[PDB]
Structure 1
Amino acid sequence: ESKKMSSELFTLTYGALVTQLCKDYENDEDVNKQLDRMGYNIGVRLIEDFLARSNCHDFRETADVIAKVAFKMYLGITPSITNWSPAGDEFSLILENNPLVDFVELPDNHSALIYSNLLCGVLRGALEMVQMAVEAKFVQDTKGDGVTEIRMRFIRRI
């Protein structure tokens, strides 16, 4: 069960938040902290909605459910799962483009700003609800890069 909408409002609204946080905070980096905390709060609520509206075990499957189901169900896309770790510890999510971006732009004076940092909190918060303590973070952003990459690593069970 899941109702749909166009990206416009969502990306537009998110751009509003980011643009405002840049005013309520004089430091590009304290914005990141807030965006993550905020993402965390959503991730905590999201996991529930998600779980209820569909059908993990080990970390390799979790990556699948995340990039093939979750990411597709909410943000309407499907990142690629590449660059794993010898013991199913760490992986990477690839995107031919930034999911929270389109037509809403901020004056560029923000070099240390991670525009879509909120996604990292969402992931951490969501997983943390399914008894999983992990870590998310960007390592490529469509920042003059070829593609968007989010690195994630299973830290410990709960």
Structure 2
Amino acid sequence: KMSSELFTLTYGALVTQLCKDYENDEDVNKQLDKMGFNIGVRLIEDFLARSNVGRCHDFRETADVIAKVAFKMYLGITPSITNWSPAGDEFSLILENNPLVDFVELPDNHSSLIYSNLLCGVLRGALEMVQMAVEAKFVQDTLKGDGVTEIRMRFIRRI
């Protein structure tokens, strides 16, 4: 196990490089999400090998495992699961900080950048590989002056 500061600074270098390569926040958002997807498709293999979940396609069990096991294992934090839809097909992950944003305050010119957008791709890619089509999106971000960071996750369909 390792503390996170070298990880967060390395992620910072990646965002910096993408900003150099695209000079447009929406393009950066997109590339972070695509990279995250590729990471998630690989990361799920590590996770399933190390965990006790096996084969399952239950959305609530999935929320619990993501929040209480995967976030802890890979980011050192445990977000809360809140704000369930009536159908039980949508939930939020609530993070007290932004785990990738220790000490990285945004320029006012970059209001549209979703700095930690990689994480949405990772969630979507990982779950695709266990036959669950989901959408993950930031709806709050402490970097933008919100009181929490919130990732909203929606179950679309079984694959």
**Fold match by TM threshold 0.5:** yes
Structure 2, unmatched stretches of 5+, are: none
Once the two structures are superposed, residues 101-143 of structure 1 have per-residue CA deviations (whole angstroms, 9 ceiling, x without a partner) of: 1134564421110000000000000000001100000000000
Deviation (angstroms), 1:57: 3.6
Once the two structures are superposed, residues 10-69 of structure 1 have per-residue CA deviations (whole angstroms, 9 ceiling, x without a partner) of: 001000001111110121101000000000000000000000011144111100000000
Distance in 2, Cα, partners of 1:108 & 1:21: 18
Query: Does 53-62 or 138-147 show the bigger shift?
Result: 53-62
> Which consecutive aligned stretches of 4+ in structure 1 deviate over 4 angstroms post-superposition?
104-108
Distance 1:63 1:23, change over 3 A: same
Distance in 2, Cα, partners of 1:107 & 1:144: 12
Paired residues in the alignment total: 155
Contact 2:57–2:130 (Cα < 8 Å) also in 1: no
Once the two structures are superposed, residues 67-124 of structure 1 have per-residue CA deviations (whole angstroms, 9 ceiling, x without a partner) of: 0000100001000000101122000000110011113456442111000000000000
Contact 1:12–1:104 (Cα < 8 Å) also in 2: no
Identity %: 98
Structure 1, unmatched stretches of 5+, are: none
Contact 2:135–2:154 (Cα < 8 Å) also in 1: yes
Distance in 2, Cα, partners of 1:23 & 1:82: 37
Distance in 1, Cα, partners of 2:132 & 2:7: 28
**Secondary structure class of the residue paired with 1:99:** coil
Contact 1:96–1:148 (Cα < 8 Å) also in 2: yes
- Give the equivalent residue in structure 2 for 1:47: 44
Distance in 2, Cα, partners of 1:136 & 1:24: 25
What is the Cα-based RMSD across aligned positions, in Å? 1.1
TM-score by length of 2: 0.94
